[PDB]
Design a protein around this ligand. Structure first.
Ligand SMILES: CCCCCCCCCCCCCCCCCC(=O)OC[C@H](CO[C@@H]1O[C@H](CO[C@H]2O[C@H](CO)[C@H](O)[C@H](O)[C@H]2O)[C@H](O)[C@H](O)[C@H]1O)OC(=O)CCCCCCCCCCCCCCCCC
Ligand code: CLA
Ligand code: CLA
Ligand code: CLA
Ligand code: CLA
Ligand code: CLA
Ligand code: CLA
Ligand SMILES: CCCCCCCCCCCCCCCC(=O)OC[C@H](CO[C@@H]1O[C@H](CS(=O)(=O)O)[C@@H](O)[C@H](O)[C@H]1O)OC(=O)CCCCCCCCCCCCCCC
Ligand code: KC1
Ligand SMILES: CC1=C(/C=C/C(C)=C/C=C/C(C)=C/C=C/C=C(C)/C=C/C=C(C)/C=C/C2=C(C)CCCC2(C)C)C(C)(C)CCC1
Ligand SMILES: CC1=C(/C=C/C(C)=C/C=C/C(C)=C/C=C/C=C(C)/C=C/C=C(C)/C=C/C2=C(C)CCCC2(C)C)C(C)(C)CCC1
Ligand SMILES: [Fe+2]
Lengths: 44, 36, 53, 98, 31, 416, 37, 328
């Protein structure tokens, strides 16, 4: 609001928690040997 | 107006964060030649 | 000064060919020839089958 | 799963809080936070980050030592409680009110 | 009066574009 | 053929051949050093002592006078010998680099992964690529520290903002406050405040290079000692063409930035060796005309800005953000102070603006540098687009074309 | 201009800039010599 | 076990079943391009005159203020602004924002972001469909030209007032002033651009006439031949050898691009490279690297100047320049 950085911090937090919720059930802990990661855990 | 500046700032940051976190959401996997 | 004849030139120059195109398309829909996704004519006056049956 | 996160969270939060207590005890908090140049604080934050992720990063996978860690865990709990109040005593009183 | 005609022509062009995009002939693949 | 690449794309045959890739890169580096040394040798061979550097098409000698080599007070060029030894050193280093690149490309160890596991690499081995990136980041930070050593300990840097007309000044108090240093980076890029270009003194320059060297050093050891995290591993493409595309995007950004930098900034590129900027020359014309009109015996030559700023009128009013070392002594709190104009105008400022009047068939070296590096930056952005697309499509596996047996579009439901 | 002990090296200096660009034409004639393999 | 909201959002955004593909680049493209579209339409229909020159003489550009579609434009920002960032919240009033050419800045910035995101979106859909990703490289040439005409020339000249107006007559005025100040006609890069555009039209008409000429008979008499092609068919719709023989006999014995791959690469490459070079020519002329100057190139024995066609072109440039430099 006042210093205009809370608008920046607040919005990327809200979308960031949505992204973190998606990232939580991604089994990306194991490392792959490939050009790109084809592993995407789609719940539904 | 300061309120218009606030609304434009949060809309711009919202769309930019949508772009940024969307491209971080395993974008190279979203291709038709994905190895199952 | 509003040019009186210029208004008719814009109006009738737009309305009449738009009318001609709309009338041609509507009667084409009645004959089942208003799609390009159909086979060529199997016979003179008989339109071809559509791609999706 | 949450216990594994909480276990390493408690010991490492304590371990940082121990070294903070020995710092303010041998130097006799927020006064040193402002007196130090911000290049030095960025220098400190950098070397902790390399240590926390590379050289002192935990791999995910005798009666004297099992009590010593419990002593360390108990002394870490006290050092954690003291530090957050020590800054407040510098915030209001300015000096640790003996 | 002229500006009304100009606005009507431009808006009608955009309407034609909208109809050409969203109410187009659906492409069917020959079988 | 064996790799499928034709002769016109024959350097693509070196993607999986690390030894010849190293040879090609070292040979290209030798070519770069050869051009650098040969160009400064060419520039000193054609250098006329009486003329300024920007009047004889010099681009590499002005880069040396900025570093405080062979330059006197006021921007005068004293000795050509330091530029000569710089050229000779670059020639000899170029010979060494060319020999090394030719050896590694022709008779060196082809596919050196097996022979030298420390030097060998695979594009998908993220640990090894992060190690290489960290080593080169450490080298870049060391180079920035070398510039700081030049600025603060060895000789010094030419300070165009020094009183009296500029002099080579050794800086002893760099701006180490991260608020100012990183507010330069987070500055808006529009008029008034010009992002990084708006650096107007030597102190912020050397302090920012200290911060950059420290950041590059710590990032280098970070990338050497760590591995990319899960989000980074799932986001990027791990292949040589992808890394080339990322470097192309970064290099394009830097090329456009340096083009605007040499066009606008007169601190890292002083107007004594590179010549005046466009706004600098326009305000020079206005200022010299005002000097003539005041010496003849508000005025139409100046105007009152809405922000209470006294600035030159006419078409020159769009360049009211221009700051020059010969305007700042006459510029006070509200801008161009009327009292300061006709009271203490020193004669060194009078000749400088009159000199910048004529350099408003002539192409300034600022124009050459700006246009050339802008051309290169844009085409490197185009190359980033090409190589990024090709890397992503080759990683996914359809860079050769659409498979006839399994066409992806035929498996999707109709759009409408 | 060029320093006095190296003033005799004036003519070789003018052709020094053109060596990097002619390396590019060397790659074209090398491929033309082998018939663009 | 339920799917997270972000997973459904990512599935819908990158869905290939949408009527218009959105994608992550479209998340930037659609709001910016819809912002610039509505703002352009409103400013074109009704907007008070903009004092572009900075000396209290405004230029009318809207339909409601007495100009038609041809003369209507979104006038560039004022000379007082220069290259300053001028959002709607940094003006004292909406009237002062409209008086200084703020709509131009808003529309231009949103449009530039939108076309860069359009390039990215073209790559994105090429990736989701499994095709080769170089259509975006082809679109990078008109985007570069728009960037040079709207952003980069104001950067070099130091004012957004020197950008191209968003109108027809404003575009012509920009062209005339640019020719007066830089002689773009004699610039080699504009010659490459004209060669690219003329050659692109030539090659488009040539290829189209060659394919249309050799269409294989599949329809009846006077029926449209376009029904002879079936969407999704595998067999070729035209006789390639007959068209190649015609093109070979037209100029010289073996001149037909027998491989259609390099023919289509040439078709895609020629106007793209030409537009790239004319964009870079316009961008380099922003920093006063003007075109060829062949003025007073012919003199007689006594020193008198014999004019050439370049001198007549220079006289035209001088006339436009003295009518543009309003009290320089
Ligand atoms: C980043 C976002 C890029 C978008 C910025 C566009 C507008 C940039 C601008 O108005 O440009 C100008 C600024 C430079 O700022 C100038 O900076 C100057 C700084 O000089 C000051 O400081 C100097 C210090 O010596 C001198 O003293 C000088 O006299 C004094 O005025 C002044 O502040 C000017 O008013 C201010 O305009 O550029 C910048 O900040 C940086 C420019 C980034 C490179 C150009 C962007 C890339 C090109 C657009 C992309 C095209 C892509 C094509 C493919 C599609
Ligand atoms: C550091 C930059 C860099 C690097 C390492 C690469 C690397 C590669 N590229 Mg990429 N590229 C770049 C920048 C780069 N490129 C830029 C800036 C563009 C935009 C123009 C491209 C666009 C591009 C395309 C379109 C292609 C590549 C391809 C390739 C591969 C083969 C290149 C080759 O064999 O050269 C051969 C070199 C030539 C034939 C030179 C041609 C003549 C040039 C244009 C002259 C330029 C004028 C010069 C400045 C002055 C000369 C004047 C006079 C003497 C003639 C190789 C992996 C090819 C590949 O197949 O993909 C992997 C491919 O098709 N690149
Ligand atoms: C910066 C320029 C550059 C560099 C360093 C390279 C590097 C390389 N290329 Mg590329 N190339 C380039 C530009 C370059 N290329 C351009 C513009 C084109 C388009 C024409 C190509 C087309 C191309 C193809 C089609 C192929 C290569 C191949 C190769 C590799 C093997 C070359 C070879 O076998 O030489 C043999 C050369 C000779 C026998 C004659 C030249 C002898 C020397 C090198 C001449 C220079 C001598 C020098 C002046 C000596 C100074 C020494 C002194 C300082 C001590 C090598 C790593 C090959 C490959 O990719 O892998 C095998 C390959 O098939 N290149
Ligand atoms: C970007 C780097 C750069 C810059 C900013 C300059 C700047 C300058 N140089 Mg230098 N130079 C360079 C690199 C550079 N040079 C290189 C690589 C060489 C080796 C060929 C030289 C060799 C050289 C000599 C020998 C001399 C200069 C001189 C000059 C000055 C006058 C230039 C001139 O006469 O215009 C000429 C303008 C042109 C030639 C325009 C054509 C540019 C190529 C257009 C083609 C377009 C593009 C490349 C196509 C690419 C293909 C695409 C698909 C990507 C000017 C200050 C002169 C002097 O004043 O200083 C001592 C001088 O005598 N230069
Ligand atoms: C980027 C710079 C670079 C890199 C990474 C390499 C890499 C390598 N070089 Mg090359 N080379 C270079 C530039 C480089 N070279 C230059 C500038 C020259 C001219 C002096 C050479 C001339 C050269 C020769 C003559 C030889 C090498 C050798 C080697 C290998 C052994 C080096 C070693 O044991 O270090 C140890 C460091 C840590 C363990 C190694 C693969 C050797 C070789 O290729 O295999 C026999 C060797 O005999 N290099
Ligand atoms: C040349 C510049 C450069 C390059 C190419 C990289 C490369 C990378 N970095 Mg590194 N970094 C740099 C400079 C660089 N770094 C500097 C100067 C620092 C010190 C501040 C760091 C500190 C750093 C951190 C803390 C992280 C990266 C991360 C990354 C990765 C993702 C970056 C991203 O997506 O945005 C990528 C492999 C991320 C990665 O996953 O770790 C390796 C990440 O978390 N970097
Ligand atoms: C034809 C190719 C070509 C040529 C001839 C040039 C030429 C030039 N460029 Mg360009 N460049 C090119 C292609 C080219 N460039 C392309 C394709 C890009 C990407 C688009 C760039 C990106 C680029 C940028 C971003 C910049 C240049 C700049 C320059 C100029 C200075 C170069 C320099 O100093 O680097 C030296 C770099 C090194 C890594 C060398 C080592 C540096 C360490 C030096 C340490 C010295 C230290 C003080 C010594 C202290 C000793 C003491 C302590 C004892 C020079 C005229 C600069 C310029 O001034 O503005 C335009 C600049 O900022 N270039
Ligand atoms: C200039 C003004 C004067 C002229 C007026 C011009 C019109 C401009 C109006 C602006 C809004 C446009 C609304 C139509 C777009 C839309 O809703 O598409 C509906 C589709 C599918 O809808 C979805 O489709 C689903 C079915 S399925 O996915 O296709 O299977 C379905 O489940 C769901 O209900 C449905 O929502 O969604 C998309 O394609 C994304 C649209 C992105 C919105 C930007 C529109 C761009 C403007 C178009 C060009 C205008 C000319
Ligand atoms: C266990 C170690 C310990 C001791 C021994 C101790 C002692 C005193 N605290 Mg402290 N303190 C903490 C720890 C300790 N405090 C912690 C963990 C916190 C964070 C929750 C904390 C916060 C505050 C705040 C906000 C205030 C505060 C005060 C006093 C003051 C009371 C005066 C009295 O005893 O009559 C005495 C000296 C007040 C003050 O400063 O003076 C009025 C005050 O306002 N404290
Ligand atoms: C692989 C290959 C390649 C590459 C290579 C290269 C590119 C190389 C480089 C090279 C180089 C890079 C070189 C260098 C050289 C140098 C030299 C050889 C030097 C010398 C010097 C001198 C001699 C000097 C002297 C002087 C002085 C000291 C002073 C002044 C005067 C003078 C200048 C004289 C190519 C492509 C071709 C082909 C294919 C293969
Ligand atoms: C020297 C100097 C200086 C400087 C310094 C510094 C401090 C710097 C910094 C710098 C920096 C600090 C930089 C940064 C940068 C960053 C960037 C450039 C980023 C980018 C990003 C990216 C690239 C990403 C992307 C993405 C996304 C967004 C999403 C997902 C996907 C991806 C990942 C791709 C100054 C000016 C002061 C002064 C003068 C001197
Ligand atoms: Fe075709």
């Amino acid at each position: 609001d006042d210093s205009l950085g809370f608008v920046l911090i607040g919005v990327t937090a809200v979308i960031g928690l949505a992204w973190a919720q998606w990232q939580s059930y991604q089994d990306d802990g194991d490392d792959f040997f490939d050009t790109y990661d084809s592993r995407r855990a789609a719940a539904a | 107006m300061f309120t218009l500046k606030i609304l434009v700032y949060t809309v711009v940051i919202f769309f930019i964060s949508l772009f940024t976190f969307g491209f971080l959401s395993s974008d190279p996997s979203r291709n038709p030649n994905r190895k199952d | 000064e509003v040019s009186f004849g210029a208004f008719l030139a814009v109006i009738l120059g737009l309305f009449i060919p738009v009318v001609f195109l709309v009338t041609l398309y509507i009667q084409s829909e009645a004959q089942g020839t208003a799609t390009n996704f159909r086979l060529p004519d199997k016979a003179p006056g008989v339109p071809g089958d559509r791609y999706d049956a | 799963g949450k216990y594994r996160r909480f276990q390493e969270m408690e010991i490492k939060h304590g371990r940082i809080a121990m070294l903070a207590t020995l710092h303010v005890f041998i130097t006799g908090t927020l006064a040193s936070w402002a007196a130090l140049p911000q290049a030095g604080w960025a220098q400190i934050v950098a070397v902790v980050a390399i240590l926390d992720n590379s050289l002192f990063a935990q791999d995910p996978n005798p009666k004297v030592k099992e009590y010593k860690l419990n002593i360390e865990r108990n002394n870490g709990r006290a050092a954690m409680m003291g530090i957050i109040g020590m800054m407040t005593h510098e915030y209001l009183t300015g000096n640790p009110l003996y | 009066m002229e500006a009304l005609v100009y606005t009507f022509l431009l808006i009608g062009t955009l309407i034609v574009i909208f109809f050409a995009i969203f109410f187009r002939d659906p492409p069917r693949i020959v079988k | 053929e064996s790799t499928g690449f034709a002769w016109w794309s024959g350097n693509a045959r070196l993607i999986n051949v690390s030894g010849k890739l190293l040879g090609a890169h070292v040979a290209h580096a030798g070519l770069m050093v050869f051009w650098c040394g040969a160009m400064t040798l060419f520039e000193v061979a054609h250098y006329i002592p009486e003329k300024p550097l920007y009047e004889q098409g010099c681009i590499l000698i002005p880069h040396l006078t900025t570093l405080g080599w062979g330059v006197g007070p006021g921007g005068e060029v004293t000795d050509v010998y330091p530029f000569f030894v710089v050229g000779v050193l670059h020639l000899i280093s170029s010979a060494v680099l060319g020999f090394g690149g030719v050896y590694h490309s022709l008779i060196g160890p082809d596919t050196l992964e097996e022979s030298f596991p420390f030097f060998g690499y695979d594009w998908r081995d993220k640990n090894k690529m992060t190690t290489i990136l960290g080593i080169h980041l450490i080298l870049l930070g060391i180079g920035s520290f070398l510039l700081v050593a030049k600025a603060c300990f060895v000789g010094g840097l030419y300070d165009t903002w020094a009183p009296g007309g500029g002099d080579v000044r050794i800086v002893t108090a760099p701006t180490l406050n991260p608020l100012i240093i990183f507010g330069y980076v987070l500055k808006s890029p529009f008029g008034g405040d010009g992002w990084i270009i708006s650096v107007n003194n030597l102190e912020d320059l050397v302090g920012g290079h200290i911060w950059l060297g420290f950041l590059c050093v710590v990032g280098g050891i970070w990338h050497i000692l760590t591995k990319p995290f899960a989000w980074a591993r799932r986001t990027f493409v791990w292949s040589g063409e992808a890394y080339l595309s990322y470097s192309l995007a970064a290099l394009s950004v830097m090329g456009l930035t340096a083009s605007v930098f040499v066009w606008y900034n007169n601190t890292a590129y002083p107007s004594e060796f590179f010549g005046p900027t466009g706004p600098e020359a326009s305000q020079s014309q206005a200022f010299t005309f005002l000097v003539r009109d005041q010496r003849l015996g508000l005025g139409k030559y100046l105007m009152r800005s809405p922000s209470g700023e006294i600035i030159f009128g006419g078409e020159t009013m769009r360049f009211w953000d221009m700051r020059a070392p010969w305007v700042e002594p006459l510029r006070g709190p509200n801008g161009l102070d009327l009292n300061k104009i006709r009271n203490d105008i020193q004669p060194w400022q009078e000749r400088r603006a009159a000199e910048y009047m004529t350099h408003a068939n002539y192409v300034s070296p600022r124009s050459w540098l700006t246009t050339s590096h802008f051309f290169l930056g844009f085409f490197l952005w185009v190359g980033h687009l090409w190589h990024a697309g090709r890397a992503r499509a080759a990683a996914a596996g359809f860079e050769k074309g659409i498979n006839r047996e399994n066409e992806p579009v035929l498996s999707m439901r109709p759009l409408d | 201009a060029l320093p006095e002990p190296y003033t005799a090296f004036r003519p070789i200096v003018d052709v020094m800039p053109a060596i990097p660009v002619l390396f590019l034409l060397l790659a074209f004639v090398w491929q033309a010599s082998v018939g663009f393999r | 076990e339920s799917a997270s909201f972000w997973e459904q959002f990512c599935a819908w955004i990158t869905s290939t079943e949408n009527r218009l593909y959105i994608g992550w680049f479209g998340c930037l493209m659609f709001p910016t391009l819809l912002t610039a579209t509505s703002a352009y339409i409103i400013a074109f229909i009704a907007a008070p005159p903009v004092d572009i020159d900075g000396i209290r003489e405004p230029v009318a550009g809207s339909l409601l203020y007495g100009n038609n579609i041809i003369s209507g434009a979104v006038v560039p920002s004022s000379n007082a602004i220069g290259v300053h960032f001028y959002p709607i919240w940094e003006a004292a009033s909406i009237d002062e924002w409209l008086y200084n050419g703020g709509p131009y800045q808003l529309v231009v910035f949103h449009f530039f972001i939108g076309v860069c995101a359009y390039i990215g979106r073209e790559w994105e859909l090429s990736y989701r469909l499994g095709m080769r990703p170089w259509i975006c490289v082809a679109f990078s040439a008109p985007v570069a030209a728009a960037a040079a005409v709207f952003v980069i020339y104001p950067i070099g000249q130091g004012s957004f007032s020197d950008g191209m107006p968003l109108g027809i007559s404003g575009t012509f005025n920009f062209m005339l002033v640019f020719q007066a100040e830089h002689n773009i006609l004699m610039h080699p890069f504009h010659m490459l651009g004209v060669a690219g555009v003329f050659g692109g039209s030539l090659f488009s008409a040539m290829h189209g006439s060659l394919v249309t000429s050799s269409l294989i008979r599949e329809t009846s008499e006077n029926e449209s031949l376009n029904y002879g092609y079936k969407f999704g068919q595998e067999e070729e719709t035209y006789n390639i050898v007959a068209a190649h023989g015609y093109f070979g006999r037209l100029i010289f014995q073996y001149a037909s691009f027998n491989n259609s791959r390099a023919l289509h690469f040439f078709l895609g490459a020629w106007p793209v490279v030409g537009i790239w070079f004319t964009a870079m020519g316009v961008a380099t002329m922003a920093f006063n690297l003007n075109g060829f100057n062949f003025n007073q190139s012919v003199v007689d024995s006594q020193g008198r100047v014999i004019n050439t066609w370049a001198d007549i072109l220079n006289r035209s440039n001088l006339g436009m320049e003295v009518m543009h430099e309003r009290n320089a």
